[model samples]
Target chain A: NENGETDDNIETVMTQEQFVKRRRDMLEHINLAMNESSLALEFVSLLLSSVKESTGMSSMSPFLRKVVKPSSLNSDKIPYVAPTKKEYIELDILNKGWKLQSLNESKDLLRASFNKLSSILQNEHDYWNKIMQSISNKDVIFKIRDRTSGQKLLAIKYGYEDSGSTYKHDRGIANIRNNIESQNLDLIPHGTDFVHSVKKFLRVRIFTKIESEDDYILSGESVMDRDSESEEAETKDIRKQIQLLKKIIFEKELMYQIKKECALLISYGVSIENENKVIIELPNEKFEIELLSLDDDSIVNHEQDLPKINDKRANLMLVMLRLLLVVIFKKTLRSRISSPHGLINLNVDDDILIIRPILGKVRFANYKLLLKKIIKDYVLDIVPGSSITETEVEREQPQENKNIDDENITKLNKEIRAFDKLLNIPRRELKINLPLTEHKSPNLSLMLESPNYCNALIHIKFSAGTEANAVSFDVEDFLHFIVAEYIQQKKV
Target chain B: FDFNGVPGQALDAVRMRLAQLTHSLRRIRDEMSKAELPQWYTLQSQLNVTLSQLVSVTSTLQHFQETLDSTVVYPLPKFPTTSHESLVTTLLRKKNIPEVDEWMKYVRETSGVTTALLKDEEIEKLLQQDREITNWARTTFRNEYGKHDFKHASLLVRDSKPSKPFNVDDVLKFTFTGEKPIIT
Candidate 1:
């Protein structure tokens, strides 16, 4: 520009404003150059570290102290001529050299870089540093100008600063602000949008960045001092958590493990549809637990399109998976609702048991984001499984280890089966297919017990014989035969 | 190029200053590539010092624009034309450089100047003369990105780099200000 190289129509040349505008590109170019240079510096540092390692080898001091001139002359001074490049190179090399010829290539590397720094100033230290920081630092706080507006450029930090396996920048940081002012360059952002899009993202790096968390608002004392505002916020958060309840629960390796485990089981089918129920089917039997409200009309089509992984073949295993989920979450689900009064219900589809836990309305986001949440009180009108029908099953608490008292449960099962097949059919002790082995072995029994069945004890004995094979007495005479022989004799 | 009979402090001042800025850029880069470095403060201070000189250099160049325009330069006989022919030829040609051409382009685009379209032959001719620009830009990108993929053994964050070589997930560009997501 000074050479007046603009003579052929200075109009074609840039105006000062345009020159400044071009600076935006210049700054970018500079940034690339700076980044490349910084990367090279890191490479330099690596070389330097190796140099330090090498310094130990040479029996030279293991530090390359002060390869730079400590001070500088003002470039504006008269005869501002810089000394020859070699002069500074020589100066730098002498300070670090031990018969400099000894360490061949490494010294060349240092000399090359050192020489570049010295080109601008035979003796300036500060100017060398200004750009070094620009090129190298991960975090920089500085000014620029649209009026020289400024912002903190945050880089998501990757590695730990303290040591391996621990710590991180913990704070986000990026580098250099070229402080030149300009109307052409737009370096700052709109205020609130920046907060939501950028700043909050960083804040989330630290905190629930949650759900109906109870605001234990401390009122300088214990209990009853609730900050209503925090209470509302917590409610809103938890409601959001509930809204995406399915997604949040699917977070870990639970579903994966569930899928694997379920596929292993036979006669079990698990399904999870948007209805928020765990439909577990075993042959003719289906045990349905509607954990969330199935009929909540407000709950239409808000499925999270999250990472969906499915298995078409493992239907049975999937049921087992869903069953396991219900087993654990059922506690969490049931704990939320207080039982509403005066009703118990059961749903049977030919042994298909559907328990829609008639849930009352529930709150979300706030109590306002309400739904007549049939908090499917996990209703189970388990009519058969519900009562032992032993009448005072209320009082005749049968032990779970039913056959623990008998070594040969095979005999007991026979007698019991005979009595039920004949006499007990006319009497009362209903037959159970449940395995009455030692303890509540799922392989063992989930059966009924009653004092009324104490009479069946005698019937069991009357029917026992080698001839009839535990079925000597007919239904009419069985208890009479027991009473005439065993009961009278035992009393005497 | 010859400044044979051309004489003044202006052009010489401009030359010295341009040399200063160029060296400042180079020196910063070189020092950065070194095996050892001073403390960051020491390093930054020196950059501050050099850039300070660079700033004055540009202002001074701007000040001498009129005098420099009127001057003429020709190669001296002593110039090494035989061996350094290309360098001599380029020096003699003495046109605007990459930085100035960039600035000139910026001015024309934003200044609301309307012009008639060039004819097809004219466009073809212009493209031939400026073909090197595309070549320059392409290579600038190729070289810079190629040599600097040092992550397993490096300090710079991946966020600052463009997306990785194999792209499963990509990200928005790193920008100083916000990028508007919605509107044109």
Candidate 2:
């Protein structure tokens, strides 16, 4: 029959097997086309929208401005530096007049200020301890490097900047140099040596050189070369000057490294593995030996491993130093992620959440790196409680007839109920009743057929108290910071 | 005029009839397109060709059906020998066949007369155009899929950001490339 003759006939034929198959195939084709059209519409919309928005952003201002309200007259006004020539002359006259009286007042002011500063430092220490305790309770662990060790170094402090009176700056540098020099000299005290030596070195190298000349200078060449030979000579001279400046800069950096290393050693005892000894062969060739001993005896035999100090635990110590810095300065770290308002601090005790920054003046990138390392290490050490086991049970025979002995059937049902109860106890806690086999080979197919049992192992002992709870909560806080920072970077 | 068992003569007559029917059908289609005659005349001509081909096939089958019954056929011992050979093969193998015999059978059996008569060049062009259209559709759809995912993700991020007075219109403008829509 001709199904394509008329629309009504085609509709009627659609119910026929042959016509139904053809109609279904045609419908599939139409559906595929419709899907393609819908997708095309969506793609065009996205491409156009993004383009429009991106173009719109072209009008955004290039600079950001912040207005600060003045709390005091001093705060409102920027500090002015006297003209270079007048500064020293004024300072000298002022110094002579107030020498005795000002000295007494200065000493008192210094003491009070120092005491306040010490209290602040002590509060910071307490805060860090609290944070650490919270983290430890959560099974969150951190390493602390003794600042006295030479393996890690602290960032330069405020007073270390190069400027001010020659005598005063020189004195400061001298103190650091003497600290370092005294580390080698037995006559000097142990705790005081390295700081003095560092001060002395800074006095001679840093402060003294400040007045010599500013190291960086710009030069220009005339368009007209009066003499080609002179121009060539000038080029060579510039190159030599550049090389000399670079060398000086390199040496200064090396000096700073030494100062940092010395400070670290004074705070934290050197690792025993780093101790070096000079070994001279009969031929007069000499090589240095690094001691690898790590026991308490290694610390006592410091003299035996002369010239080199322990560094076996240097890597571990470095991690500890980073952790201390992060704990103390976490408030500064979170500011880089998003606005401070977004921060949430959760307390373990009341489960109360507080919003606060953990560190000040640190960027989100650094905070994220430090937090990730700490958490990853913590999670790795945690033991999971889950375990799995399997067993086989005898299959019950099916009864053929409807009629049965009531007493016997009841007993059988009771036995089945007991078996079900036995199965309810976790396989890990239960002992299997299977006998040993002489074959020792397991039936692979039968084992595969058995259902697998898994138990959720809970480690209740690792629960965090209030203090450790804070650290656990802070990890999530920092994670939010990380994601916010990532988004911001993408937007930029 | 009963040309039943004259195998060679019967094939010649069938071929001649098919040639005449095909030519008449083409002429009628051309005349109808030009408005030179009524539509019924074109339809009548097509029906005539279809009926004539059917008759020719029936006549050939009848001749072959009788030949096997009366003549001692080769590979003889089979009672169902007439059904063994296909209808088209029987027509082509007829003795004293006209040159049009093979062409007529091919047109009638393989593809109907309408398709068989279509120019090879035209068929090839249609197929090429269809492929080009398909490829264009495929590429357009793929690009749309990617755009859809990207726009959805962007929308999600924008909506999830902490509450500030977010301009939905601005977001839509940024996402879409066309003129802003006005709703009543």
Candidate 3:
């Protein structure tokens, strides 16, 4: 009232026109008030008479009727008196006055409830909104029922479940749920929490066969770059889950396949160390293969750091080994999906072909290098003051694999033609010319072939006027025989 | 009070105020008596109008209080005979009947506070402080509310109407059952 208008009464003289207008308005309002009051009164009175006639008694009971009987001795107790009018007036004034305490209490409760509920609602909205934004069906998120709480939950697959991987050590699944106390999203691994590959090295070291003071030196060792994406690919994002699983599974299978292949080569100087490492020993050098859990924290120090040699050749060999495994995986996939050929026996030796091919090439290359060194050192040294010539040639392979006359087998042969070429030991012919005696410069021809991992077969033919002796398997002794019996005796 | 004895203009004001006040009260009463109640806002607005008119009536009656007190009302010779005697007596009576007396007493008892101890001026001061606190609290709440960016929660939640709030049932379904939402 203070801000809006003056509440104080205005003192003014009443004019004739204003009085007339006021009078007219007063009459109109009086008529309306009279009409409403009479209407209400009529209703009450009619109700009272109707109720009294219906019951044939007073509205109040006989007990209270006696108390008010003297005050109203008539049929209808309509008019009554107020015994304590002054006291009533005072009490009414006090009753309608300020009720500040109750009003304040009401206001306080409202404030507290509203403030508390609003923040709670806000947090709830934010948490679920962020969750919905992060997860999608394309991320391979699935719904799984929780056994403990019997609640349906979200799970993301981080394994090769659909990639036809049958290695069942770890299924690679994790459930997505809110943390109990923190109320934030958490991943609970279904079996194993985190997976890393048990990576191994296939190191080939070269040494001289002849015993000397300075005998063995590190020739070449397998060197590979650590998978750069491995560390970054394992972030908490659900999208990267499947990829990480696939990587570890592939690596684990590779190590397993190599171990299996090393079994057949044990007699050929290949031995397993502590169940995870394979050692391949040659007469001149050795190859060490070991699997280390690369990403595991506690076992990280188990792999002792060895100085790496300059070995692009070994690196290429390692790459080739991995590529062979990949090809094996492709073949496995094809076999799993391909229609079965009728009546063919299922071979139990459907093992992966990773280690064998690489081992063959390695053994063959070492043999060639060793043969060249032996010839240069022994043959050239023994036959002095005489010119010598050496010529070696590889035997041409004819396309002689008989066709099985079946469509599937022929198609398969074509598919595996490149891989089949790597399995066989190649044939070679080495020829040398030496002036053994005057007027007789004879040719010494040798044929070399490796039928197994460690065995190098050789046939020796010596020419003397088209009448020669053909010998096999005793090259070193035969060379000594030629130097002593043929060369020195014939010269005398 | 008799209009002939009092200031006719002041009487007119009181009469106008009471009539408007009664009209609003009657409208509210009729609405409450209906089989189906009206919308809350509709009832609230109607009550607000009724309260305003009531305040006007009080002000008008106070303005004309002196004149009304000086005047007297009585049945004239031309009024109805013994058949209409109840109406004449009811209009003339100043004291409340037995029922209104009982109601006033009940109100005084339920009010609970003993007025004998507290001074009138002290009570008035307490009431003033209470009103000031209520006003400040209301203002603070509204200001804080205005600062908040009140985004519709339907945007945050899924499968609900635009104007509707995020449903608890829907939230629980998504949380436990992992029910995927359609791109509505």
Candidate 4:
């Protein structure tokens, strides 16, 4: 054998004396490089420097190669959050506002607000009055809870799941996959293999948001690697679409949503293999931008592309963002336990209670009207802004909120009488055939049929649970009046 | 008997051999920081060859131990007193040179030992035989060591004992009491 000694063999014959003699001989020789310092000092320094040079090299220093590779697609160090280049609150506030339109930024507000409020109540309220007192402010104040570390915010800092997960699908896509099997699918005729795809897409999908290796992305090139390649052609295509969308997603400034809950990072790398490879999964919802118009492709163009925010929508969005800020703040602590330290774990049951002072959710509805009313109550001047549906003036015509702007008592009484008169007939019209407790409000959302045409119609939907799927009403005729009157009497 | 001639000749030979050996040590260290540095096997061979030369020189001195030990070396007629006196006095008078003293300390520490089985006659004979045995194995190994894989791992018991790398939250030190533990 070219190598004669095995550790076991050496142990068999070498006396402890012989072994130690050889060791000291070698050790003594090592210190012969000790001209620089006294023995003890030189001895310690040499060993320590050996360690420093080891984990970690100097001349072969990969400090640069170890650094994140810049995006070839010009998306590195993006200002926006990945997958969707939505503007972050800070950068937007800093440069002042950009003329940017959001994909129903407030879509998840009511539900997220409700859940956030519930967490606040369940965690902190412990009493009915406390819960009421928290929401009694009417226009809830939200604070931004940005807990992300500076490393997380770095463009190249680092790099799931549920019911482990929750399922998200839209009305139209759900329609395409009306009934699907478990396998991946494709669309052939008017039907989407969507059924099969939906079956797969509809599983416990994790909506993880990773900052760019430079800052953020939808993360997947991670450890605990899984074979996502076994996915269908459609899935691959969608993944490719997500990959290409990389440039588009990061182009916008990052938002408050780019936090740890959305992304996991391996800031320190090992093999440097997973560097940029994680395949992040985006919400099937942005599939909204895809299907927003029958030809949604033409609509997503940042420049010539459709959606433009008029002063009406801008005023409304800005106002509602302020309200969203308030909603984000209501301190909500979740008493969920998490056990796994290195990977995933089951919790320790209420042992770990997290105070999520600012949490959020998404909904199909836009509270544009809510902001208008709240602003109307505060400003007392005509906002003349466009209302959510396609109309503004004709929507709230009757009660004529204009006169109430000035503190006129006689006018208020007269208008209150008119409002009462208006509500008197609606009471019978509301149909008390079912107890009010069983009622569901007519859901309202901003319907941007074509973002460019910007005459977004009102999309209203109504419903219940697993057995019952809600139907959407794209009513343009008198939807606003229906919503206004219903709420006016309740307010009165 | 010319004690002067034989001892003088022996010291001259030792000085020559030591100068050669020290040159190797210096050359090895200098070569280490260069791009042209040889492979570890090459370097180890370089080191071992020089070491063996030193060892051979020591063995020769060991062979004539009685002659050299009792001879009592002295400075040459031209040797300086004030400036170069250090060289003269240190070499002739000192029991061990400082570098030599340091190496002994290293040997003491590395082996975790000091005592040896020495019945004078027995030990002197024993040290000679083991010298080749250990030296053979050690050199045979060093012959290819630098050429071997550097994929060294660890006992790696990294429970953050010894010392912490980053951001030490608390450091407790230098407080000890001779208190004995109470019986449980």
Candidate 5:
């Protein structure tokens, strides 16, 4: 810094001695250049004299002779000859030979150049040919730049990001690099992990006894490999490298998501097996989610003559699970766009609910079935001239609190209420009609809810305007209590 | 033609034509000897100009050869004899320099032409046949060139310019990397 400041001050305001010294240096340089020029001029004059004496290039002007400077290879002596002499004939023959030699040399150069170009032209043809095939195969191909070469390169995209996907991740892209030895375009995947290991999935299989023979039927499966049949049947041409990579990454993510869900659903009979599978135990059916590679020879399907109703139901369940995941994706996208909120814990309903959606539907339907059977046996059959009619009602919205003044509190309450409605117990109302028409019978209501996969929480209510009575019971004595309560109320 | 000396006007005319021919020929030879060759069309145009100049030079020489051969050259009294005596002699010299003779000898040895017993008529016929083949070869070249597509005419190999007006990779990145929505 001291050197810099001093130099800067000196540059801004120079002293008298500095000016004199700079001029002296300039004069010294000029003298040195002048001396160098004189030496060059003397060398040129000596060459001029030598050229005039030896090479006989002195016929041209001195300036022109400098332009076409002949070396020691050129001779000064030339002997005279008559026009009809043998020497004249020999010179003509030599001139003809030069023409022939030049023609041969030019032909060889053209041949070599043409051969090199022809090979490159063939390469261009092959490149375009493969590109055409890829286009026809319905592959997503686009042009990109080679980062190192700064050349335009062909790239193929095989991710769902460009499609209707709301899942956030890197777009799977692969550059088509040429394999020189094979002369084939190789797909080199770029973005994601190209893991080819086994992936875990939840597989639901139903056990049924038909004519004293036990049969295990595959109901639903969310396996990692999609179109496994086609994959096995396909040929050796494995062109879709990026596509396979994307599928593997997604499948692994799905299993990871399901595993996190299963951890929170231990009460619902969902258990882990070897940290790779999520197994759920039901009354009649079992879900065995296990990690298995595509190459694994796992025998699940034995023999089937015709498609059964159970198989369709299983397929529908798998479809529901998949659809629920997409619904979660849609909601995630909605929440992101709707609110600029800070990161918080995921809500029970807002998170991806793959296993829960299908599980809830199955358990709720089973509970309702048990309730109906109870009503038919205990109330409808036993009690004479008494019938129960059932109807599903949509839950009402929560009443707004006028007492809450704070807008943030009001919004928070709304969000909490919305979540509560989504995860609340499902209720069904029933009207028990009595044969004796002395007085009006009480309104019977049943809330068929399952906190876990197998257990049910049946809350029965007998509503008679303000005179209402609530009772919780298992599905066994559900209609027994309702029928007795109604008969006693009618008598009173 | 019987000659006692060369005519000054004829010699001067021959020198101008010879100089122009030599300049063009030298340029073509220098270009060919370079490490990096010029483009085909560029080199072809230069060769075409040189060939036309050569024709003119030969015709001019042939027209003035009779006068040129008969006349003799000598330095005048006004010439700079003391300071440039060698320059004057070189101008009046009637023989080729050693380099020209050496090149003639090299061309003759390399030709592989057995012309010791061949008649002048036979050589003339061969030269005429060579011209016919040359014309046929030129026509074939033009016909072949038209058959192939050279629509995007550029150098044989050149830097590949990015053809996309918009960056496609950026679009893909945006699509995957979801942006926060602006709330109005």
Candidate 6:
């Protein structure tokens, strides 16, 4: 059985040739595993570093300082520690403090604190998206505008309030009648100068508080707790102040419209020859004699009049110019709270508007509240006091005729109805279909929902045959792999 | 068997041996010119040829054997068992097969060697070194890099870029004194 000639049973045990071949094969497999693990670790390290850098967190170790050294081949220099559950919790607590401080600062400045908070949250969300992408090899495509849909809605509402007052007059009927009569239409004066004056005043007041000469700290350790009823009550009071400011602004806006309309009548060739006798000179005489005899006609004849209506064109031009000024003023106001870098530049055809980053995202539910503050503090507070004075004067002034009051009421109702028809048309909200697969996992969802707690669960599955042999290797390799995967995911 | 006949036969045998020697000598000379002496000697041995025509055949044989020994003295790179001295000595002693068979096992085991190959002691040493360096680096790096004061300094530098270096002492002193200092 043990003779020099190979026995069948003895041959089952590898010969010298077979042993060499098996060793080579085993080594190749080991090398492949090593290579894979190394690559995963490297990617994880990069992701961790990127996240820390973005968040302004310190790098993991001191060796990372000299990682830039030339000819260094050591892998240990990499900072690849993925956040543990406890660390994540601490970070969440830290983030809350940061958010609260930022919000308090914004409120003190009478700026939109909620909007600022929203943008910060968006940044945090973007960070998470990247981590998920790195780990799962997923592609995330987010439209910048889509992120700010809530803010956009608020902006649309603000735009309507600002621009909607133009329809309150009976200019459409007046224009048609003038066209039928072949007469010139009157021009309206631009209203932007008032808006500009108000904006300038607001800018000064807001900046004064924010950039005061005195050194003041808005944040303290005691203010960190969310459950502090006193702080919450104070925040509510600030909200009320903002709402009051908005109301004042709306009233002022209405007065501005009335002033502009008054300017329009003056520009329409209506001249006061005497306090009681107002005259509108006719361009033609075909029907002037007939129209002059009418009780309401102090102007030209209704028909057979060559339209000398350059005033209408002039007034329209003025209005357009005023709108441009309002847009510019709003842009300036937005830039005060958010740095130029934090604004979104949107181009729709010929119009360009810079939207505040804080106001652009829908993820923050408090955006509307924030917008109210901004509109109140920046727009309402500085509205001309003359509007109030004018209203008071009108209320105190004696009526010339008893019927005039009824006529004014009827005219106001008609104007409101017309405006409601023209500008208050409601449209359906746009529905975007985002793939469910692209949505964040439930565990991450819980973390974001309870961001204050910073609790998170990371599930790791080890393949049966490929599980690491050593405890250190398993932990280190897993950390690296997860980190690298998360950061690559972010890139996608 | 006549005595003259036997002597004649012996002379004929001597002539044949002489012819064989002549052929072998010519082959050796040709092999020398072509630097194929080893193959030539192998061929001669295989053919069972004798070199009787040479003036000193025994000495010539001995010289060839010595040259062969020198040429194949070193063990083969793969096997390391069949050296020229061992092979030739065994062959001369009629024991080549037995010697080669006995040394086969030793040759197979010691072939491939790598310096970078890890051992238990080496692994332990590497791990220890890594721990020491990592600990030192972490402490030093944290001190140099992760301080709130540094962040404050960085902010000052950023706010006053392309100007003279930010003077922290001046800043602090001004805050305390509330009075303008002379700038030199």
Best by lDDT: 5
lDDT of 5 by residue, A96-116 (tens): 756677677779999999877
True-structure RMSD for candidate 4? 35.5
**Per-residue accuracy of model 6 over A374-480 as CA lDDT, tens digit each:** 23432322332211111222222322222322323564544333322222111101111110112232111000111111112222222223333111121323433
Give the worst 10-residue stretch by lDDT in candidate 6 chain A.
A200-209
Per-residue C-alpha lDDT of model 1 across residues B1-184, encoded as one tens digit per residue: 4222333334344444544554566565555444132224446557857766675755566455543333323222332332343452343223445465564444434332224333653454456448667768888898868876543424455645755454222224214335433322
After superposing candidate 4, which stretches have Cα over 4 Å from the reference?
A1-492, B1-7, B35-38, B75-93, B97-184
TM per prediction = 0.21, 0.13, 0.36, 0.19, 0.40, 0.14
Tens digits of lDDT, candidate 6, B92-179: 2231333555433333222222233346434644665696798798888888886575327797887787765657677777889975
lDDT of 1 by residue, A1-492 (tens): 111221221222345767555635544565554443232222121121234423322221211322311111112222212222334433333323323323444568899986665553422233333333222334233422221112222211111111111111121211121222100111122122100121110000001102234453211100111112111111213232222222222222232232222222221234345344232322112132222212211111233323211122223332433343332233222222323441122112311121111110010111112111111110111211321121323223432222334323665554333332232112223222121112221111122222222212111222222343222222224433433443232212
Give a tens-digit lDDT track for model 4, residues A1-492: 101222122222335677556645544564464232122121111111234423221212322222211111122223223312433332222222111112123345655786665564443223322223221322212211122432212111000001111111111111111112121222211133421322111011122343433444432111111223243333223233233223122211112111111221221211124332221222321111101111111111122223232222333432332233222221110111112332222112311111110111112122333333333332321222213223433324433432444323564445444433333222111110010112432233333232211223444334343455444444333545544543443213
What is the alpha-carbon lDDT of model 2 when measured against the actual structure? 0.29
lDDT values of the candidates? Answer: 0.29, 0.29, 0.41, 0.30, 0.42, 0.29
C-alpha lDDT of residue A124 in model 2: 42
List, residue by residue over B1-184, the lDDT tens digit for candidate 3.
4323312224334444544555555555445444132325445466756656675765557445433322322222222331243443344223335455675555445454655653764576488679789989998889878876643566656665347455667677788889954333
Candidate 4 clashes: the total is: 39
Model 6, residue A6: distance off in Å is: 73
**3 or 4, greater by DockQ:** 3
Each prediction's DockQ? 0.02, 0.00, 0.03, 0.02, 0.06, 0.01
Say which docking band candidate 2 falls in: incorrect
* Runs of candidate 6 exceeding 4 Å displacement: A1-160, A163-238, A251-492, B1-184
**Per-model root-mean-square deviation over C-alphas:** 29.2, 49.5, 24.2, 35.5, 19.8, 44.3
Tell me the chain A TM-score of model 3.
0.44
Sorting all predicted structures by TM-score, with the top scorer first, yields: 5, 3, 1, 4, 6, 2
* Superior by DockQ: candidate 5 or candidate 6: 5
Off by over 4 Å in 3: A1-191, A194-224, A227-230, A234-250, A253-265, A268-287, A292-317, A327-366, A369-395, A398-414, A417-445, A456-492, B1-184
In angstroms, the error of model 4 at A141 is 68
Worst 10 residues of 5 chain A by lDDT: A70-79
Which parts of model 2 are misplaced by more than 4 Å? A1-236, A267-492, B1-184
Q: How does chain B of model 6 score on TM-score?
A: 0.19
Poorest lDDT segment (10 consecutive residues) of candidate 3 chain A: A68-77
